[PDB]
């Protein structure tokens, strides 16, 4: 199989190392307005793959992209600028691979992968967006940490806007099948609100932090699209919080955010309206709004 | 790391040969009363490792299991058609009597991890006889049936089992506890998630799925006269979690105190498994329907042992 | 991608378990005619599967093995299997034209050339197992002795999967030495008494492990699981398999083991490597030996 | 266990990235004078973690390398655009000074892992201040030329680079050795086995492959500043080789007793790595052009360490 990446700066090259390592792909090709800059990425992954497996890395246009089953968008030059990049990149990309599932990672993401999908004319199961994937992720990190057991036995979910309104699902949350709670007191730990709020701080924050210590984030993110694409790529039919063009959510309508969503060959195969309290659900219909007006002041 | 495996038979060898295919361990020793079998299935896996990865598999004495850091007991016999896991007990627990002492003077540091069945029941005769902290002596128990409840679970919504959170509790045997109560896909109570996928679990497709996990080992032994790769699957994830200290959390058996009342008991509850086996244990809430059920297996379970003075 | 595997024995199940943990494919299909056995093999195995990778596992016919890139053929006695070949190998086609055919059934290289000639594919879409356990044999038995990963040895069997099969000493090499200096300092140096007991280790393995436990499989298994993810990925990786040749050391339309290159479209390439005059006899041996034993046969 | 990477830069984050994504350690600390930097990229890769394997990444000081089985170091100024490896010599001997000592107060027993260019000469320098054994002080070396030695000629032949065996030896650096001679794809020689493959290996084609070795630095410091994936993934695999015992085969760089006459001096050769680093070195087969050739490369080492007092 081959997979995509249009946009080669540290979020793409970071998702085209993971990639190659994890083995996901039998080839890999980086597309970049600097041409100098995707060559030099495709080179030093290709020097990679021999301690890892057989990875086809390299460089192209958007015509070496063809037969892709999945394209990873994430090119970025504001919402003005990025938006005209999308107008650029997507019908150049369809063009090549138009059975595609497109995975957009350019922020604000959920804006951007409601503009990919105006702009593709697909199912919009197959315009899917990083979304709160990373943030679920940081969720599971955190409580990990605080519990010190392994992040694959947290089970706890972000979803909404990847962006300040995001709503971390605590009413829910398990660990190992556990109710996040008991799990927790069994553990000697009490989830006070103060340790709560400092958990949600540390989701919350967690790409300001980063970025303010090393000007930006990339590994995280280029991991969980890794993760994405080999769940596309193998039909894995498994659930993920990405973000889709979403008819309607707590009464607003037409708006791409995060919900559980199962992933498989076909980009989104099924979305889950998840189970929150009333202060939760609050917080998603807020999200949605937010989300809702941004990309109409955008005509999207 | 080296990890030791007692009984080179059916079971041993299939966790021989996953640890060996995932490279769980440096260094992997078959230990059996056969020498020529555990000498057979060491070759015949060291064979498959120049496709994998390097583990030096062979077959051992009892000595060789030195420096092991998890040794798994699979020595014993397996129930036959008709017959329940209760029923080997008496045979397996005079196999034990043999087993345990070898394995501790050897490998004293080791966490042992039981296999054998009944092996709840296993699991309690090995901790008796050991000596060891109730944490070093763990029992697979339940976790091949949580896994069997998820993946029938799976295929009845064509999801990856990876996304069906459910599991099973108790005694890994016909009395054991389905836990549906806490069941969950994609964050949502299992049962609203079916109908939400178009395929409803009714009360009907559920006992036909109780079935699946409770009568699984029969159907299997059955059709193919064992079971052997489900449970050497299982094994290997295990010794993974010891050997790498995961601190994951899993449904294993260990000796416990105290269960719906019912006093020094081993069955499977929800652990976390690390480089000191189990390392803490959660007592989860449960139905009126479910919590009953615990009780009950887990009676039945410290009467089968209390009867040979475990 | 989907899998069959036809023959769901000690042999098939063995491959669909490391197929399994390995995650090589999304969907392995197991068939056999006892139906039974297939299903509980299938059972099994699904249950390792939420431990490891999703894999949908199942038991089924023929139609089943439908869209199937690659499916595994582990089905007087050579009269018999000769036969059940002629029986499985148009059905496995007629299901799955565009699969690889991967033989494991004894004698392989017999039992591949009679699969070739049955299917009517191109001659490098109907692929033995071969020497490819002969040689991870061979490399593990050396890297014992060395001491090393065995994945730092390079050494190869060629020819007949059996009695006759040559081990290449020549070309061996350990990190860009040959073998022979690199033993003769890691310190032991290999005399022609080793070299003898390792021969023996590789030639006799099948002989001690079914004395000892009535069947190999396991390193057959992983084995088979390996060829079939170069199969399914495009791996364009060198294996030495059993494969219909036109010409070996002057024997003609013969098929045995020699290095070749597996892919997509099974059998891609074929290196004739070179070797000492003692090889060479011993490789063109090996070729007359499966020649008449095919020609006998009828193929 | 655990792995320590004292600098935090693009070297050493890739490397930790790597480490996390193959779950090579269950911990991985960083180090760097930047505590911030450290920080950020610590949590970013702890971040990834729960898309792949359970591994504790934090950053920290020297001292929260205490108990690591190996350092991995990655501090120091990298090449700027037409820089050459040796022009960085003054300025990381001076970086190691600090370095060295302050690693092994806290992790005395871990293997060293140089990185830092020029990674022989840096080698020396190490394994100079530490006091260790020779094979304990690992660089790198050419372990990543001979990677892209083995991934161009796959592309060349068109098959997977696993599949090549061909080494770079001498300098990680202009005066580097390809060793063509012995080269081979999978267990057959390497002319062989190109004409097989339709391939004549012209000498304007193994211009064009040494050009493609030697430069790829160059090439991709132009193209987008530093090199850290390529060298990130092959310091992961010498980690993992180091943690399993692996006893596997590769060219890296340690200090060597005699080298083609020239005496104590480091550069890279075959080597056989375990848990104690290097455990065997080879002097493999050479032609009298690759054995001039890997003379002169270790002289330009021996006179760079020597200037140093090295
Ligand atoms: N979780 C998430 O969804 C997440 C996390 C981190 C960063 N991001 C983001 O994703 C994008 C990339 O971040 P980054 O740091 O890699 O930025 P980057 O600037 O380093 O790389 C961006 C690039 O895209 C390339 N590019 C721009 N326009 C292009 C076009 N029209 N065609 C081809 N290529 C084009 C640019 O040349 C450049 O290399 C940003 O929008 C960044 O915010 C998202
Ligand atoms: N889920 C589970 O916990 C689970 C699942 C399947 C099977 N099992 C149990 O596993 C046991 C083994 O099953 P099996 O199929 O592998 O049987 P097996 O007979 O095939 O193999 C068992 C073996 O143990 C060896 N052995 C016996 N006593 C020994 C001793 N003192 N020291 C060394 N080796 C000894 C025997 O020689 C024999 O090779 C049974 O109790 C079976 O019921 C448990
Ligand atoms: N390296 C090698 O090439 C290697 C190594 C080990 C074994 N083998 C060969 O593997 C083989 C199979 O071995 P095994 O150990 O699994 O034996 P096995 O008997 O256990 O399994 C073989 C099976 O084939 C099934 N089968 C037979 N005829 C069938 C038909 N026409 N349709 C579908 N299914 C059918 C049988 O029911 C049985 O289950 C033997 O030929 C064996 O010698 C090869
Ligand atoms: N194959 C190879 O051997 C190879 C390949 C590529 C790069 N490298 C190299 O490795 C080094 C790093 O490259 P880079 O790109 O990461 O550079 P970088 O500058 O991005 O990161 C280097 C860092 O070292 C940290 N550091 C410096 N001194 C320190 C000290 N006393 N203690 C703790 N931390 C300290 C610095 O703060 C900085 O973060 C260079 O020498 C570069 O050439 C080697």
Redesign the pocket.
């Known amino acids: 199989m081959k997979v995509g990446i249009?946009?080669?700066?540290?979020?793409?090259?970071?998702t085209a190392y993971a990639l190659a390592l994890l083995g996901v792909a039998r080839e890999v090709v980086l597309?970049?307005?600097?041409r100098k800059?995707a060559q030099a990425h495709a080179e030093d992954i290709l020097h990679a793959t021999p301690f890892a497996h057989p990875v086809w890395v390299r460089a192209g246009s958007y015509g070496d992209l063809e037969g892709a089953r999945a394209v990873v968008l994430?090119?970025?030059?504001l919402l003005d600028r990025?938006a005209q990049?999308f107008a650029?990149?997507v019908p150049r990309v369809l063009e090549a691979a138009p059975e595609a599932v497109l995975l957009?990672?350019?922020?604000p993401?959920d804006v951007?992968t409601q503009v990919a999908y105006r702009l593709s004319g697909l199912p919009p199961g197959r315009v899917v967006?990083?979304?709160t994937?990373?943030?679920t992720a940081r969720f599971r990190a955190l409580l990990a940490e605080y519990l010190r057991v392994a992040p694959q036995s947290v089970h706890a979910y972000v979803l909404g806007e990847?962006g300040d309104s995001e709503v971390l699902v605590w009413s829910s949350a398990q660990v190992g099948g556990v109710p996040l709670l008991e799990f927790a007191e069994a553990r000697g730990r009490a989830l006070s609100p103060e340790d709560r709020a400092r958990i949600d701080e540390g989701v919350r924050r967690a790409?300001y932090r980063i970025i303010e210590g090393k000007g930006?984030?990339?590994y995280?993110?280029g991991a969980?699209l890794a993760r994405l694409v080999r769940a596309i790529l193998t039909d894995e039919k498994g659930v993920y919080t990405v973000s889709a063009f979403t008819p309607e959510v707590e009464g607003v309508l037409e708006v791409s955010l995060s919900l559980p969503r199962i992933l498989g060959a076909g980009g989104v195969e099924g979305t889950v309206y998840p189970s929150l309290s009333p202060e939760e659900r609050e917080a998603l219909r807020r999200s949605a709004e937010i989300l809702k007006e941004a990309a109409f002041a955008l005509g999207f």
Do not use: E
Request: charged share 5%; glycine share 20%.
């Open positions: 249009v946009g080669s700066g540290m979020v793409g090259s970071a597309v970049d307005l600097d800059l994430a090119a970025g030059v990025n990049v650029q990149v957009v990672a350019t922020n993401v951007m967006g990083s979304g994937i990373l943030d990847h790409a930006a984030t990339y995280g993110i969980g």
